[model samples]
Target: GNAAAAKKGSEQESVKEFLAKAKEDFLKKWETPSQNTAQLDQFDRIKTLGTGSFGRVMLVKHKESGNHYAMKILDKQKVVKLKQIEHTLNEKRILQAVNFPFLVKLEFSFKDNSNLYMVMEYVAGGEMFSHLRRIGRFSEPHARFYAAQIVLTFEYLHSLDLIYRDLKPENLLIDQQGYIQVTDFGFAKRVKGRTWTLCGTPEYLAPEIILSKGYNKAVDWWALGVLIYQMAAGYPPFFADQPIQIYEKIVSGKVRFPSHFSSDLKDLLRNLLQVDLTKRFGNLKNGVNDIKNHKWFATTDWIAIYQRKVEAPFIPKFKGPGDTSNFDDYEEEEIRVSINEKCGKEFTEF
Candidate 1:
């Protein structure tokens, strides 16, 4: 009876300690002041970095700081038409709250007559997608290194109750030093426990998401497994010509591994990609620690990697800070402006 009582007491104490530490960390992150609007003319737009349905991300130079930044310009009308008002705001809020070594930082945000703007730190090494395509696939050691960094990133985001729904090679940017920086928060969300959103890339979506059942951070673990597999095998484990077929395969939980994959790697991926959220490696009672302690990551030096002391496997070549050679070429085009009809009033507080 005494031994059992003592064990119970120790467990209770551990829970309290964990909650206290979590509170302290949350406070530290929340205490950082959020930036307000800045003048648009303060930056000299250099070139178009990338473009999509929403708007274009431009490479801009801050006149005062002499710093290069990626400025995301969103069309207010288009944002409203796509019913992305909340998502756009959420992106701004999440970026403001997030300050980590492996994540991109938002400098400031503002708006113009027709668009919303977000200034972000420019990572000059270019997209991980380009690198992955160029090199085909990475070895187990290389994949492990990148996966370890992503684990730390997911752990940090989950600590803040943030779910990064969009996890893909296109959203990961590499710096000049080869460190991965997670970008694109358009699909990210903050959930206390679970959310019912059938979102994310088809190849990486968890079964819970596809089935319209509630899901939490466990989805990220599943996506991480897909990412690791792609890094090791040069293609996603589940792929089809159409998204529906991919979804069907994902729901079936049929993962085919190449013979070259080690037993430990296979085990880790299996656990992470488990269809049962309750049994998933990171979603288990032990949480992210289970993932960190897995045999596949046995060689990972967590502390050293967190501090960025470990040398990265690849270093991108660039002339200087202002180099845009590594980035894909974008045609020079005029900024399209539209008269705000309903979005102006809706974004009045913006």
Candidate 2:
């Protein structure tokens, strides 16, 4: 064991050297030498932004430029042990490739002996989760505006063959302009075809996925339907005590809309939250055009919304770029792993 530890120590040192050279080469490719374009130590870890599974996201400030960013730190030891290393790797690769206004952007990715780091654009707006909870429900116009943006975003991702598996309001962040910016691609599956991985929020999972029959991009549209319903109704269409119950209800495919919901909106939701794949709005022979031409979206200016020419319904005020008010205080202890708990292979290409 001592000799293995000694070898691991030497291997880690080599990885450290490699990471340094990689960061230098990556930054050099920028060619502009911006002030904030530096740091592993160049940024200050301000506070815990949010926590999921592996580690916590920290709100960071650039030491020199005072710019803010959300730093996602992951435990290499736990990642390798659980054999979910590919999830994080997939996230980084897809985040780097996506170039949409509504989607969150990955600025830089890094690695160390025991941890993996992702420095992403700090979306200063508040989470749609919080806003929806406080307000109870959004007005028709408000929900439509938010839903429209996500429609355009999904259209863009599907065009690139990337299927965003999760579409809950928690992952949707609203910026200063109140526009929805989809964040946290951690669970996203880049499906060029049918993928059988049973990974996604239960409420958003399509019938095909719930039963492991192999699903396609239609699942995203299903989630979008759930999102739209939840936004205007203030709760998921299918709610239950446990995940199994939720899955049962989903497979059953019966959704009861709020009594006040409009007729046009009803028509769209039925087409979207469907059990039969062929009857889905986005997957039909007409494709996205069917959804675009739906009576509910009759007045939507697709290109104008894509261009961000439409006004956001709710603009949030902020104290600063590093403002913590938008996010609730997270007191959960971050998973502490030993520095010598080596898994350099997880970051082989990082």
Candidate 3:
């Protein structure tokens, strides 16, 4: 069997090189100190955009600027009950620290006696999953456009030693311009070393993760291959009726590409979906540079892609930025949650 060892000896230094230089510029764009704007009272709740066990995401309008934003109102009780206090707070921190066009921005995060509020720029075009489900699949050009931006997104995040454990179309929200905003940082974290947490979509889980081995950013690199495959084929490459079955398929590490996939696309996916960390495109000696230099992305212009100069394959039809037609309607509920004194003190920073 051909394989490369999963090593991080030089990976740390190389990422710092890219981060130290570009972060100096992107750092300037981070949200400034807030007074009234970030306060919970500064906005009017419009409607519920989406719902989850922990909370509901709402569309809100800022009273001062009259601009709309997405608000995540998390019930503190549910967070503590589910043992997600650490992850919940980490999500807020990662959101505040990272600033990139392809990644979502955190306007502010605050907590009431019963709940926590996280306000972010409202991505009205909705989920990339919705678009993909509607269109069946993206052509090679379309797939390249979206996936290339994600490459830049990963490049920026991994530079900061952050690992986004979850990567799927549902986590990618499209804007009016058709570009994607990587949202829901609940599973993202600052990983200075390898972590053993099994937190990711079942289909996107890597071999090491399924084996309960310590894993790092290479997991995200592997998920990227799964994402590209789903985007092109309109479904994930691995499937079964249960999650355990899915993990079995993942550990086996065999992917049969669709007949229509071009040679370059197949080659890229094959290398990305590899189980050997040493042989993986993004985890190898050159790091993400190797993935950027892959044949599938040969035509991508990194600068232009970052500037969002190139056109997106399919633009979501929107009447305005505040529109929520792309998302499904959900029932809104009153905030009914309270955290214990110990957990309440843990949220002092946000």
Q: TM-score for each prediction?
A: 0.85, 0.79, 0.84
List the candidate 3 regions with Cα displacement exceeding 4 Å.
1-18, 21-37, 47-51, 320-343
167 Cα displacement, candidate 1 (Å): 1.4
Candidate 3 accuracy as TM-score = 0.84
Best by TM-score: 1
Query: Which one is best on lDDT?
Result: 1
Model 3 lDDT tens row, 31-144: 342322366678888888888898888889999999998898887778888888888876776677678899887886677777788898877576889888999999998899
lDDT (Cα, 0-100) at 292 in candidate 1: 93
Q: Write the per-residue lDDT of candidate 2 for residues 209-295, one digit (tens) a residue.
A: 988888899989989999999998999999898999999999999899898899999999999998988789999997787888899
Model 2: residues >4 Å from true position, as ranges?
1-39, 44-53, 61-66, 81-84, 320-341
Per-prediction backbone clash count:
0, 0, 1
lDDT of 1 by residue, 1-350 (tens): 69999996897687567656865665564555354468778999898878978888999999999999989898888888889888887777677667778998888887867888889888777788888898999999998888999999998888778899999999998887778889878799878989997888889999899989788889999999999999999999999999999988988998999899999999999998898888999998888889999999999988678788888988987755545555556878977555544477756645
Ranking according to TM-score, highest score first: 1, 3, 2
**Model 3 misses residue 78 by how many Å?**
3.0
For candidate 2, the TM-score is 0.79
